């Protein structure tokens, strides 16, 4: 009762201890997971995190500490979401992203609004027919559910379906849509949650018109804030030639400040830190040192893996909470049907529309991995548990259905997308001349200059080299760059593993959990050297 | 509108396709020479990345000449139009189209045949195999590939992949799809 | 009143926004600071952070948001302190630290207990004489103040006094004491804060005996937890040859888990994460890839510089708070005198005791930089604002005196230690033969093998190479290491100044907490090693 | 106790200092030969780091011999004992001590004089300057340093740094402090 020499005090170190245990156990499970290529080529890593979150939630339930864990909006929206989005936006291949900006936008904004509106309205129409039965629910609740339920993550299944089907435009669609619909879903989530605050009778026609105007203003203002802060981040790294240690700190602090500045102006915070990473990419990591750029990209997978791990551990903690488990036969089995049917015909319709104005069509196999690439994961789940439990009467049913859909998509669709794609796409001279045909086409598609946004790429490169590089790149770097530009201005299965791959078939990967540098860019540099050695034959 | 009409008959394009490709041509004509040279094609950023890019560029120009005008651009660029079945099923007059399957096959062939001999020797095939296979491979394996290729294709006894043998060995490959392009309007 | 298209919502993004602004503004001020060597060689960077914290606190006071900022114990002790201590312990030169373990311990444990006890008791004796006057204060409050006030940071002034006096043993004393007395101060802080909870009458003799026992149990148990977790961290990186991306995550998560495990067992959490970094150093960064080891050490200066920045921003905010300002003439001007006099004679006495059993004496110039190396800063200040405002009646006076002492030490002593040392230590053949004499001595001091803990270094190296490396290093790494050991076993005026090799004793080691400072004199070691090995090939063996 | 007494008289150490240095010697004697060789010294981890380490090791051994026993170890190791003033002010008999200032000077000298000529030529000084100056320096600068050193020290005309000139040029340096060691007890 006096002075205690030592006191076991677990309640003290209990939040940080459990969070750090989550991250550590996920990292150990990643040690086990990536051990064998026979696993990482079959199981999406999101499935590992979801199963591990289930197991750790089972431990939490055994310890009877379910009520100790709550995901709060100020934590997800300020600390758990920014790292994920910044990681996605900082590893975005800029040339592919901007050469396919319209396609990504159509799959990510119209595709999300299509999925959200159709799922919400179809569930509401089912509800009006009495199939669900005696749910105290309204139209805005259904639209909120549909909006959060459109937060697909098809890039989570990228590393596994690209064992059997590689297409670098489909990669950027999957990766762009994964990232830009987090923004669009959160925009729709905020709009319909503001509507839920007002109520199904307080929302007038002008309120809905302001909702539409808010969608566009929020999205575009967030993008603009992100571009401004990417300019500022590119600029500040210009002046860190001497103090090179603070450069990784700048990339994360200024991206975070873009996120919070948009969240301060009520703009799209996700789009701000998305484009603070997409746009800072060229000049950051040109001004940053080599040693300080590995820190920036090891820390981005460090922050995003940890953030996604925490949300997936919370998914497990809720997936074992027996007080949120509300199972409505119709609701669950029609959410599964609607989000899958409407995703399929949404992709089919958008791909048909895009293919009318494309030089390389999106073949039905590309549309298949988009339709089967629901993979609803962290963002989707988090947006459901962050719902207001009293403003949305049937929130527990939403959480249960979202957990069920997260598991169904990530585990059933995430695991069977590789067998399915490999099923749907089912001799030496044949292969050699086929590769020659592919290389001819990627030259004709290139000569005609209708693949990228070539006119705007040319216009940007002129503006980048003459104006932007003068303010965002160091003087000596400008001199070296112009010297380099001046000196370059004068200028059966064995066979399969030997041939060059066509530019269209580079195996790009984004993992959020490991660094996956495109190992086919080595081909580009090898051939460039071979042609330049051939360009020295003229002796010019 | 007449100028965009001789090109339409000779090639098969549409007026808007020809207009867009002409805009691309005059953009490619940095120097404004009314025509286009080897280095104007070489100036394209990602043709130097193409393993077969130089053969493509050379194929754009006629043998002997060292320049191409817009009509030649369109002629060598029209082999990559897709064929529509209902078109050839409607007015059957002749196998003229520059985008016919044999014409795409002949384009790739003339890439293989740097001599334009109409026959691909072992040396020509080995040269193109070298040009389009990673440097790490041993030239012994590459020669094995070349001679096995000729042997499995030259079902004649001449040890040469001549043109008729090319089509026969490619009878299984969908040339019509993997060398066809939706040129924009 | 309906649906708003856009709403300016600053109260929402207000804590993270201001914290990120703090870090960003400090980083920009570091861009300015390190621009000219004429500044970084004169001003300790801690002084930059303190002045910048003052300026940003002036902005906060202008905006009238002083009451919005509070440093809470769960934030300092769980998020702000671990990065600083882990950074210090992970860049500790292990050979110097362990070859001088006893000297560092004497300067860091006895030196802290001496400083704490003497300052606390001297302030209490002054208070009993009525000079301070009408302070509602007791003995335990004074001892708590003395304990927190012994949290010196002499490594903060290292980069500037080593422009004029380099000595790699004094570097490890300054760097070891900076790090190990954070532990000892926090141990004393916790002990005397538990006593303050009980009160000046509830503390009995057995309570004080348990206090002493708690000091030792806490310190040693924290060290042991740290060693266990450094074993675990070294072990887990053995298995990350394939998944190399999670290695920097392991170094920080497992070090943090050691910190919290000691904080869970009520042990010294600082000593746990100190020794989780000191001990993991060899095998971590042997198993980690080169690319993943730069992340570990760029992120450690990233987390430590940010945490110290954030504590110094709180110092600035508290320094402009006009409701915490309590100025007792006697208390302030005697805290300044006592912490300076007792530090001076504490170093003089300890150095005299150590010099009785040393092969290289600590010259009076070394004792000078230790005595003038108070530089009380982040830890000292934070421990004061974390005091219980009602259990310690005169807490505002403690905070005011600690702020005044932080400023006096860091700005006055931190800036005038370079002129002072350079004042106190105030021809071609002279210099050449002097360097030859130095090189002869560092060989005789080496041959006789009384400098390091050579017997224990030998014993450890035997145990490390035969047993520990078998479990903490990868098999192929063990095979490569033994092959390398086998192939090396067969081979068992101012211009002149800038040209000569420097003696091993005079390597310019630096630790900054704000920048990476690799010892650039280790290049000399490798150059000479190659020259002698090329001379060892002359035998053709 | 007699064995630790002849060493005490010859060198000047204490019994405990001799005992500790004997323990260090027998630890250095991996191989247990009763004596100690060049490679036993070379086996010390941070003598190979010393720019002058090899000269030190050679100085430990007598000229001609290739081994040293404990008595020789202590003889060559006693030059680095400090001198106490009250000791030499008490019993003034002779300048015998192996730790006298001239003896430390002579030790460093014999390092410079690899020939043991008693005089340092330009070649010997240049050799030691090379051995203890970074490789980046030009040998022209190094020769300038060597010859300037001899010229500023050899106040005689022989272009050699002979021993008496060494002491004269070092008359300003506290040899007594920067080459003295508190050997532990
Ligand atoms: C069936 C869908 C329902 C009707 C559409 C709904 C409103 C969308 C407005 C027009 C949609 C289609 C735009 C016109 C056709 C089109 O695709 O040319 C294509 C453009 C641009 O496509 P790209 O930039 O990829 O260029 C490629 C190609 O040119 C080629 O050269 C290469 O093959 C490739 O390599 C290049 O990259 O695509 C785009 O511009 C896409 C525009 C992005 C829209 C942003 C969202 C704003 C819409 C309103 C939001 C509310 C939701 C509505 C409710 C459902
Ligand atoms: C005037 C001081 C007041 C009295 C001391 C208080 C109790 C401390 C116990 C003994 C202190 C002195 C230890 C014996 C003498 C000593 O220094 O040999 C030295 C030892 C070890 O020193 P080193 O390891 O550095 O070896 C060097 C050398 O041998 C040499 O070879 C090389 O020159 C060098 O290069 C090597 O490194 O030093 C040590 O062991 C230091 C021990 C560390 C103490 C830990 C703290 C526990 C004490 C109680 C805590 C409560 C506080 C008390 C109230 C004030």
PDB file of N, CA and C and ligand atoms in Angstrom, chain A residues 96 98-107 109-111 113-114 117 169 212 215-216 346 349-350 352-361 449-453, chain B residues 20 184, ligand 1:
ATOM      1  N   UNK A  96       1.670   6.368 -68.211  1.00  0.00           N
ATOM      2  CA  UNK A  96       0.481   5.556 -68.425  1.00  0.00           C
ATOM      3  C   UNK A  96      -0.749   6.207 -67.819  1.00  0.00           C
ATOM      4  N   UNK A  98      -1.455   9.413 -67.339  1.00  0.00           N
ATOM      5  CA  UNK A  98      -1.923  10.573 -68.074  1.00  0.00           C
ATOM      6  C   UNK A  98      -2.204  10.274 -69.532  1.00  0.00           C
ATOM      7  N   UNK A  99      -1.567   9.261 -70.103  1.00  0.00           N
ATOM      8  CA  UNK A  99      -1.966   8.846 -71.423  1.00  0.00           C
ATOM      9  C   UNK A  99      -3.278   8.113 -71.458  1.00  0.00           C
ATOM     10  N   UNK A 100      -3.779   7.688 -70.304  1.00  0.00           N
ATOM     11  CA  UNK A 100      -5.065   7.022 -70.191  1.00  0.00           C
ATOM     12  C   UNK A 100      -5.931   7.708 -69.154  1.00  0.00           C
ATOM     13  N   UNK A 101      -5.799   9.023 -69.026  1.00  0.00           N
ATOM     14  CA  UNK A 101      -6.522   9.731 -67.979  1.00  0.00           C
ATOM     15  C   UNK A 101      -8.023   9.614 -68.168  1.00  0.00           C
ATOM     16  N   UNK A 102      -8.505   9.762 -69.396  1.00  0.00           N
ATOM     17  CA  UNK A 102      -9.937   9.703 -69.617  1.00  0.00           C
ATOM     18  C   UNK A 102     -10.522   8.333 -69.346  1.00  0.00           C
ATOM     19  N   UNK A 103      -9.818   7.278 -69.751  1.00  0.00           N
ATOM     20  CA  UNK A 103     -10.297   5.925 -69.495  1.00  0.00           C
ATOM     21  C   UNK A 103     -10.353   5.636 -68.004  1.00  0.00           C
ATOM     22  N   UNK A 104      -9.314   6.033 -67.274  1.00  0.00           N
ATOM     23  CA  UNK A 104      -9.303   5.859 -65.828  1.00  0.00           C
ATOM     24  C   UNK A 104     -10.429   6.652 -65.187  1.00  0.00           C
ATOM     25  N   UNK A 105     -10.640   7.889 -65.634  1.00  0.00           N
ATOM     26  CA  UNK A 105     -11.715   8.704 -65.082  1.00  0.00           C
ATOM     27  C   UNK A 105     -13.073   8.077 -65.350  1.00  0.00           C
ATOM     28  N   UNK A 106     -13.278   7.540 -66.548  1.00  0.00           N
ATOM     29  CA  UNK A 106     -14.557   6.917 -66.852  1.00  0.00           C
ATOM     30  C   UNK A 106     -14.788   5.680 -65.998  1.00  0.00           C
ATOM     31  N   UNK A 107     -13.763   4.854 -65.821  1.00  0.00           N
ATOM     32  CA  UNK A 107     -13.924   3.672 -64.986  1.00  0.00           C
ATOM     33  C   UNK A 107     -13.993   4.002 -63.505  1.00  0.00           C
ATOM     34  N   UNK A 109     -14.918   7.359 -62.039  1.00  0.00           N
ATOM     35  CA  UNK A 109     -15.938   8.316 -61.649  1.00  0.00           C
ATOM     36  C   UNK A 109     -17.308   7.887 -62.131  1.00  0.00           C
ATOM     37  N   UNK A 110     -17.452   7.641 -63.430  1.00  0.00           N
ATOM     38  CA  UNK A 110     -18.710   7.112 -63.932  1.00  0.00           C
ATOM     39  C   UNK A 110     -18.904   5.683 -63.459  1.00  0.00           C
ATOM     40  N   UNK A 111     -17.835   4.898 -63.435  1.00  0.00           N
ATOM     41  CA  UNK A 111     -17.947   3.540 -62.939  1.00  0.00           C
ATOM     42  C   UNK A 111     -18.345   3.482 -61.480  1.00  0.00           C
ATOM     43  N   UNK A 113     -19.965   6.072 -59.816  1.00  0.00           N
ATOM     44  CA  UNK A 113     -21.310   6.617 -59.719  1.00  0.00           C
ATOM     45  C   UNK A 113     -22.319   5.634 -60.285  1.00  0.00           C
ATOM     46  N   UNK A 114     -21.960   4.928 -61.354  1.00  0.00           N
ATOM     47  CA  UNK A 114     -22.849   3.892 -61.857  1.00  0.00           C
ATOM     48  C   UNK A 114     -23.047   2.803 -60.820  1.00  0.00           C
ATOM     49  N   UNK A 117     -24.966   4.294 -57.649  1.00  0.00           N
ATOM     50  CA  UNK A 117     -26.364   4.603 -57.910  1.00  0.00           C
ATOM     51  C   UNK A 117     -27.166   3.346 -58.187  1.00  0.00           C
ATOM     52  N   UNK A 169      -2.023  -1.320 -70.158  1.00  0.00           N
ATOM     53  CA  UNK A 169      -3.127  -0.369 -70.088  1.00  0.00           C
ATOM     54  C   UNK A 169      -4.180  -0.852 -69.111  1.00  0.00           C
ATOM     55  N   UNK A 212     -24.748  17.792 -56.451  1.00  0.00           N
ATOM     56  CA  UNK A 212     -24.032  17.552 -57.702  1.00  0.00           C
ATOM     57  C   UNK A 212     -22.903  18.563 -57.880  1.00  0.00           C
ATOM     58  N   UNK A 215     -20.115  17.620 -55.644  1.00  0.00           N
ATOM     59  CA  UNK A 215     -19.306  16.536 -56.183  1.00  0.00           C
ATOM     60  C   UNK A 215     -18.198  17.096 -57.062  1.00  0.00           C
ATOM     61  N   UNK A 216     -18.572  17.929 -58.029  1.00  0.00           N
ATOM     62  CA  UNK A 216     -17.575  18.410 -58.981  1.00  0.00           C
ATOM     63  C   UNK A 216     -16.610  19.398 -58.339  1.00  0.00           C
ATOM     64  N   UNK A 346     -21.677  -2.527 -65.907  1.00  0.00           N
ATOM     65  CA  UNK A 346     -21.076  -1.206 -65.931  1.00  0.00           C
ATOM     66  C   UNK A 346     -19.761  -1.193 -66.680  1.00  0.00           C
ATOM     67  N   UNK A 349     -20.514  -1.779 -70.452  1.00  0.00           N
ATOM     68  CA  UNK A 349     -21.029  -0.589 -71.120  1.00  0.00           C
ATOM     69  C   UNK A 349     -19.948   0.467 -71.291  1.00  0.00           C
ATOM     70  N   UNK A 350     -19.166   0.723 -70.244  1.00  0.00           N
ATOM     71  CA  UNK A 350     -18.099   1.711 -70.356  1.00  0.00           C
ATOM     72  C   UNK A 350     -17.031   1.272 -71.339  1.00  0.00           C
ATOM     73  N   UNK A 352     -17.447  -0.643 -73.919  1.00  0.00           N
ATOM     74  CA  UNK A 352     -18.000  -0.469 -75.252  1.00  0.00           C
ATOM     75  C   UNK A 352     -17.902   0.981 -75.687  1.00  0.00           C
ATOM     76  N   UNK A 353     -18.172   1.903 -74.770  1.00  0.00           N
ATOM     77  CA  UNK A 353     -18.114   3.318 -75.106  1.00  0.00           C
ATOM     78  C   UNK A 353     -16.687   3.770 -75.363  1.00  0.00           C
ATOM     79  N   UNK A 354     -15.737   3.299 -74.559  1.00  0.00           N
ATOM     80  CA  UNK A 354     -14.347   3.686 -74.758  1.00  0.00           C
ATOM     81  C   UNK A 354     -13.794   3.094 -76.039  1.00  0.00           C
ATOM     82  N   UNK A 355     -14.155   1.847 -76.339  1.00  0.00           N
ATOM     83  CA  UNK A 355     -13.618   1.172 -77.511  1.00  0.00           C
ATOM     84  C   UNK A 355     -14.020   1.854 -78.806  1.00  0.00           C
ATOM     85  N   UNK A 356     -15.062   2.679 -78.778  1.00  0.00           N
ATOM     86  CA  UNK A 356     -15.441   3.447 -79.953  1.00  0.00           C
ATOM     87  C   UNK A 356     -14.421   4.514 -80.311  1.00  0.00           C
ATOM     88  N   UNK A 357     -13.527   4.869 -79.395  1.00  0.00           N
ATOM     89  CA  UNK A 357     -12.607   5.977 -79.596  1.00  0.00           C
ATOM     90  C   UNK A 357     -11.202   5.584 -79.186  1.00  0.00           C
ATOM     91  N   UNK A 358     -10.833   4.330 -79.408  1.00  0.00           N
ATOM     92  CA  UNK A 358      -9.535   3.829 -78.995  1.00  0.00           C
ATOM     93  C   UNK A 358      -8.813   3.220 -80.180  1.00  0.00           C
ATOM     94  N   UNK A 359      -7.490   3.236 -80.104  1.00  0.00           N
ATOM     95  CA  UNK A 359      -6.655   2.563 -81.084  1.00  0.00           C
ATOM     96  C   UNK A 359      -6.370   1.126 -80.682  1.00  0.00           C
ATOM     97  N   UNK A 360      -6.185   0.862 -79.376  1.00  0.00           N
ATOM     98  CA  UNK A 360      -6.087  -0.524 -78.892  1.00  0.00           C
ATOM     99  C   UNK A 360      -7.362  -0.801 -78.123  1.00  0.00           C
ATOM    100  N   UNK A 361      -8.179  -1.712 -78.630  1.00  0.00           N
ATOM    101  CA  UNK A 361      -9.414  -2.036 -77.947  1.00  0.00           C
ATOM    102  C   UNK A 361      -9.121  -2.724 -76.622  1.00  0.00           C
ATOM    103  N   UNK A 449       0.972   7.762 -83.581  1.00  0.00           N
ATOM    104  CA  UNK A 449       0.863   8.684 -82.464  1.00  0.00           C
ATOM    105  C   UNK A 449      -0.552   8.941 -82.009  1.00  0.00           C
ATOM    106  N   UNK A 450      -1.391   7.913 -82.013  1.00  0.00           N
ATOM    107  CA  UNK A 450      -2.744   8.025 -81.497  1.00  0.00           C
ATOM    108  C   UNK A 450      -2.937   7.237 -80.215  1.00  0.00           C
ATOM    109  N   UNK A 451      -1.875   6.664 -79.656  1.00  0.00           N
ATOM    110  CA  UNK A 451      -2.029   5.855 -78.456  1.00  0.00           C
ATOM    111  C   UNK A 451      -2.085   6.760 -77.241  1.00  0.00           C
ATOM    112  N   UNK A 452      -0.991   7.429 -76.924  1.00  0.00           N
ATOM    113  CA  UNK A 452      -1.028   8.268 -75.755  1.00  0.00           C
ATOM    114  C   UNK A 452      -1.854   9.505 -76.026  1.00  0.00           C
ATOM    115  N   UNK A 453      -1.746  10.454 -75.109  1.00  0.00           N
ATOM    116  CA  UNK A 453      -2.120  11.824 -75.425  1.00  0.00           C
ATOM    117  C   UNK A 453      -0.872  12.521 -75.953  1.00  0.00           C
TER     118      UNK A 453
ATOM    119  N   UNK B  20      -6.706  12.841 -89.769  1.00  0.00           N
ATOM    120  CA  UNK B  20      -5.961  12.695 -88.525  1.00  0.00           C
ATOM    121  C   UNK B  20      -4.549  12.193 -88.784  1.00  0.00           C
ATOM    122  N   UNK B 184      -8.085   6.021 -85.611  1.00  0.00           N
ATOM    123  CA  UNK B 184      -9.130   6.894 -85.114  1.00  0.00           C
ATOM    124  C   UNK B 184      -9.665   7.789 -86.224  1.00  0.00           C
TER     125      UNK B 184
HETATM  126  C1  LIG E   1     -21.837   4.585 -71.093  1.00  0.00           C
HETATM  127  C2  LIG E   1     -21.377   5.742 -70.209  1.00  0.00           C
HETATM  128  C3  LIG E   1     -22.517   6.722 -69.914  1.00  0.00           C
HETATM  129  C4  LIG E   1     -22.306   8.084 -70.582  1.00  0.00           C
HETATM  130  C5  LIG E   1     -21.042   8.788 -70.072  1.00  0.00           C
HETATM  131  C6  LIG E   1     -21.320   9.666 -68.848  1.00  0.00           C
HETATM  132  C7  LIG E   1     -20.629  11.033 -68.942  1.00  0.00           C
HETATM  133  C8  LIG E   1     -19.171  10.904 -69.388  1.00  0.00           C
HETATM  134  C9  LIG E   1     -18.799  11.930 -70.462  1.00  0.00           C
HETATM  135  C10 LIG E   1     -18.333  11.278 -71.774  1.00  0.00           C
HETATM  136  C11 LIG E   1     -17.952   9.798 -71.624  1.00  0.00           C
HETATM  137  C12 LIG E   1     -17.135   9.289 -72.820  1.00  0.00           C
HETATM  138  C13 LIG E   1     -16.237  10.392 -73.393  1.00  0.00           C
HETATM  139  C14 LIG E   1     -16.219  10.386 -74.921  1.00  0.00           C
HETATM  140  C15 LIG E   1     -15.698   9.060 -75.481  1.00  0.00           C
HETATM  141  C16 LIG E   1     -14.343   8.651 -74.898  1.00  0.00           C
HETATM  142  O1  LIG E   1     -14.298   7.853 -74.033  1.00  0.00           O
HETATM  143  O2  LIG E   1     -13.159   9.226 -75.397  1.00  0.00           O
HETATM  144  C17 LIG E   1     -12.005   8.879 -74.677  1.00  0.00           C
HETATM  145  C18 LIG E   1     -11.850   9.895 -73.551  1.00  0.00           C
HETATM  146  C19 LIG E   1     -10.373  10.025 -73.220  1.00  0.00           C
HETATM  147  O3  LIG E   1      -9.840   8.731 -73.212  1.00  0.00           O
HETATM  148  P1  LIG E   1      -8.203   8.580 -73.148  1.00  0.00           P
HETATM  149  O4  LIG E   1      -7.640   9.758 -72.419  1.00  0.00           O
HETATM  150  O5  LIG E   1      -7.846   7.338 -72.397  1.00  0.00           O
HETATM  151  O6  LIG E   1      -7.601   8.523 -74.686  1.00  0.00           O
HETATM  152  C20 LIG E   1      -7.377   7.273 -75.274  1.00  0.00           C
HETATM  153  C21 LIG E   1      -7.878   7.244 -76.722  1.00  0.00           C
HETATM  154  O7  LIG E   1      -8.041   8.564 -77.156  1.00  0.00           O
HETATM  155  C22 LIG E   1      -6.958   6.522 -77.729  1.00  0.00           C
HETATM  156  O8  LIG E   1      -6.201   7.494 -78.396  1.00  0.00           O
HETATM  157  C23 LIG E   1      -6.003   5.441 -77.180  1.00  0.00           C
HETATM  158  O9  LIG E   1      -6.588   4.197 -77.467  1.00  0.00           O
HETATM  159  C24 LIG E   1      -5.732   5.527 -75.676  1.00  0.00           C
HETATM  160  O10 LIG E   1      -4.424   5.103 -75.412  1.00  0.00           O
HETATM  161  C25 LIG E   1      -5.897   6.971 -75.226  1.00  0.00           C
HETATM  162  O11 LIG E   1      -5.440   7.122 -73.917  1.00  0.00           O
HETATM  163  O12 LIG E   1     -12.513   9.405 -72.438  1.00  0.00           O
HETATM  164  C26 LIG E   1     -13.021  10.399 -71.597  1.00  0.00           C
HETATM  165  O13 LIG E   1     -12.789  11.536 -71.807  1.00  0.00           O
HETATM  166  C27 LIG E   1     -13.888  10.010 -70.403  1.00  0.00           C
HETATM  167  C28 LIG E   1     -14.429  11.236 -69.684  1.00  0.00           C
HETATM  168  C29 LIG E   1     -14.351  11.061 -68.178  1.00  0.00           C
HETATM  169  C30 LIG E   1     -15.645  11.445 -67.482  1.00  0.00           C
HETATM  170  C31 LIG E   1     -15.360  12.144 -66.158  1.00  0.00           C
HETATM  171  C32 LIG E   1     -16.550  12.060 -65.209  1.00  0.00           C
HETATM  172  C33 LIG E   1     -17.560  13.178 -65.451  1.00  0.00           C
HETATM  173  C34 LIG E   1     -18.912  12.641 -65.912  1.00  0.00           C
HETATM  174  C35 LIG E   1     -20.047  13.046 -64.977  1.00  0.00           C
HETATM  175  C36 LIG E   1     -19.862  12.502 -63.567  1.00  0.00           C
HETATM  176  C37 LIG E   1     -21.181  12.043 -62.948  1.00  0.00           C
HETATM  177  C38 LIG E   1     -21.497  10.584 -63.273  1.00  0.00           C
HETATM  178  C39 LIG E   1     -22.586  10.439 -64.334  1.00  0.00           C
HETATM  179  C40 LIG E   1     -23.699   9.473 -63.924  1.00  0.00           C
HETATM  180  C41 LIG E   1     -23.460   8.039 -64.398  1.00  0.00           C
END
